[PDB]
Amino acid sequence: SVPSQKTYQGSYGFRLGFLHSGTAKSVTCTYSPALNKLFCQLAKTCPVQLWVDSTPPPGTRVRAMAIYKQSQHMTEVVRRCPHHERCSDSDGLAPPQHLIRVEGNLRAEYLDDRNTFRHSVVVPCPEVGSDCTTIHYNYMCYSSCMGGMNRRPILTIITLEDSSGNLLGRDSFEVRVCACPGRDRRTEEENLR
Ligand SMILES: [Zn+2]
Numbered sequence: 001s002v003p004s005q006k007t008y009q010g011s012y013g014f015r016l017g018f019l020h021s022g023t024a025k026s027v028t029c030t031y032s033p034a035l036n037k038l039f040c041q042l043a044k045t046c047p048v049q050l051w052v053d054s055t056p057p058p059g060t061r062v063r064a065m066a067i068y069k070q071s072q073h074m075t076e077v078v079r080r081c082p083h084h085e086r087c088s089d090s091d092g093l094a095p096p097q098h099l100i101r102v103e104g105n106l107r108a109e110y111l112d113d114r115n116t117f118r119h120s121v122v123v124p125c126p127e128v129g130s131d132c133t134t135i136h137y138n139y140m141c142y143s144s145c146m147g148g149m150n151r152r153p154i155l156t157i158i159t160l161e162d163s164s165g166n167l168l169g170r171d172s173f174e175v176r177v178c179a180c181p182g183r184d185r186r187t188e189e190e191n192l193r
Contacts, residue, residue: 001075001115001116002067002074002075003065003067003118003157004157004170005067005155005157005170005172006170007170007171007172008167008169008170008171009169010160010167010168010169010170011054011168012052012053012054012055012056012160012168012169013051013052013053013054014050014051014052014056014160014168014169014170014171015051015169015171016048016049016050016051016158016171016173017048017049017050017051017132018031018033018038018047018048018049018173019031019047019049022182023182023183023185023186024182025180025182025183026182027181027182028040028041028044028045028181029041029044029045029046029047029181030181030182030185031173032185032188032189034189034192035174035185035188035189035192036172036173036174037173037174037175037176037185037188038156038173038174038175038176039175039176039178039181039182039184039185040139040175040176040177040178040181041177041178041179041181042139042140042141042142042177042179043089043138043139043140044138045103045136045137045138046136046137046138046139047134047135047136048134048135048136048137048158049132049133049134050062050125050132050133050134050135050158050160051131051132052160052169056125056160056162056168057162057163059124059162059163060124060125060160060161060162060163060168061122061123061124061125061160061161061162061163061165062122062123062125062135062158062159062160062161063120063121063122063158063159063161064100064102064120064121064122064135064137064156064157064158065100065118065119065120065156065157065159066078066099066100066119066154066155066156066157066175067118067154067155067157068149068152068153068154068155069152069153069154069155069174070152070153073152077116077117077118077119078099078118078119078149078154079097079098079099079119079148080096080097080098080099080140080141080145080148081141081145081146081147081148081149081150082147082148083145083147083148084140084141084145084148085097089140093106093108093110094108094110094121094140095110095112095119097112097119098110098119098121098140099119099139099140099141099149099154100119100120100121100137100138100139100140100156101121101137101138101140102121102123102135102136102137102138103136103137103138104136105123105135105136107123107124108121108122108123109121109122109123122161123135125160137156139175139177141177142177142178142179143175143176143177143178144178149177153174153175153176154174154175155172155173155174155175156172156173156174156175157170157171157172158170158171158172
């Protein structure tokens with residue numbers, strides 16, 4: 001099977017938002033609207049905003065999952081490479097095999113799907129004075145990792161779910177985990193032009 005990647009705002013007007021971090025060679029995470037693609041360094045904080053037009057019910061959750069972007073690879077489970085899955089960089093909560101972690105949320109749950117074997121991380125659902133909520137993700141392998149992503153592009157799919165896991169909303173973005181996100185974004189954006 002292959003998870004749907006179709007954008008779906010749903011009843012609550014769910015969609016993502018990204019900061020404007022620029023493309024300085026020092027930057028650790030940067031998002032390209034033109035490419036709908038996030039470029040980030042290994043294991044660095046990736047702030048992703050969650051926007052809604054109205055507040056979803058108590059018990060609503062937000063799940064993240066990675067899939068390969070190319071159709072010929074889409075049935076393969078995205079996982080950490082043979083090196084990184086064994087490097088004992090556990091935060092005590094994320095399984096060592098999971099590519100995507102949520103940073104600084106003790107209520108994060110990590111799922112190994114019993115049927116598809118795919119990995120995901122899910123958190124429960126702004127503060128006073130704020131207009132959106134932000135989740136902080138980490139990507140724990142480089143796009144280039146041999147025996148893992150192996151230079152294949154991935155997408156992250158973010159789904160808004162009810163307490164049963166039923167779909168309420170969906171958005172997605174491509175991700176490249178690389179040493180120099182600023183330069184790579186600049187390069188790919190120029191290539192697109
Ligand atoms: Zn790796």
